[PDB]
DNA sequence: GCTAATAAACTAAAAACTATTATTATGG
């Protein structure tokens, strides 16, 4: 995190899309600390989704959704509980930015990838 | 020169169905 902060500290200094290996080191890296998202502590988790805005925001230039890490995210298992929201945090940064609602870059079914939320309704 | 009892509607709570209430743990 400290390390990720300095490196986002600026911006319009350096933004490294220029080699595939910048992206695809900064997408893996994304998908590692959105693997390790959660707290218990409601604020240093807040912290992180602000992070994670941020980076979104600044970058994009080398960055990809993966849309599957967030849909077993936010589907959970279709509990009672209020775990799979964080994923639905995720949602929020994705819409943070101008990114599309669920890109199929594959395509799980881009049907009921919403009608999980439906459910989570 | 006869109280052997039973057919007792009463004032019975000894469910709360579902509706606000409130401490908690709070948050920055």
Same mark, same amino acid.
């Given at each position: 995190?400290? +390390? ?8 319009? *200094?350096?933004? =490294?899309?220029? &080699?595939? %290996?910048?992206?695809? !080191?900064?997408? #893996? ?5 959105? %693997?390790?998202?959660? $707290? =218990?502590? #409601?604020?240093?988790?807040? $912290?992180?989704?602000?992070?994670? %805005? ?5 970058? %994009?230039?080398?960055?990809? +959704? =993966? @849309? #599957? !890490?967030?849909?077993?995210?936010? /589907?959970?298992?279709?509990?009672? /509980? ?8 995720? !949602?929020?940064? &994705?819409?943070?930015?101008? *990114?599309?609602? @669920? ?6 079914? /881009? /049907?009921? @990838?919403?009608?999980?939320? &439906?459910?989570?309704?």
């Amino acid at each position: 995190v400290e +390390i990720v902060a300095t490196i986002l500290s600026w911006t319009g *200094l350096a933004t =490294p899309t220029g &080699v595939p %290996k910048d992206e695809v !080191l900064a997408n #893996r890296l994304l998908n590692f600390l959105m %693997k390790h998202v959660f $707290h =218990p502590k #409601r604020a240093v988790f807040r $912290h992180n989704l602000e992070i994670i %805005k941020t980076l979104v925001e600044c970058w %994009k230039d080398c960055l990809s +959704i =993966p @849309y #599957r !890490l967030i849909f077993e995210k936010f /589907s959970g298992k279709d509990p009672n /509980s209020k775990d799979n929201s964080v994923g639905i945090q995720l !949602l929020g940064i &994705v819409m943070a930015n101008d *990114l599309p609602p @669920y890109d199929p870059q594959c395509g799980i079914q /881009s /049907s009921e @990838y919403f009608q999980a939320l &439906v459910n989570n309704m």
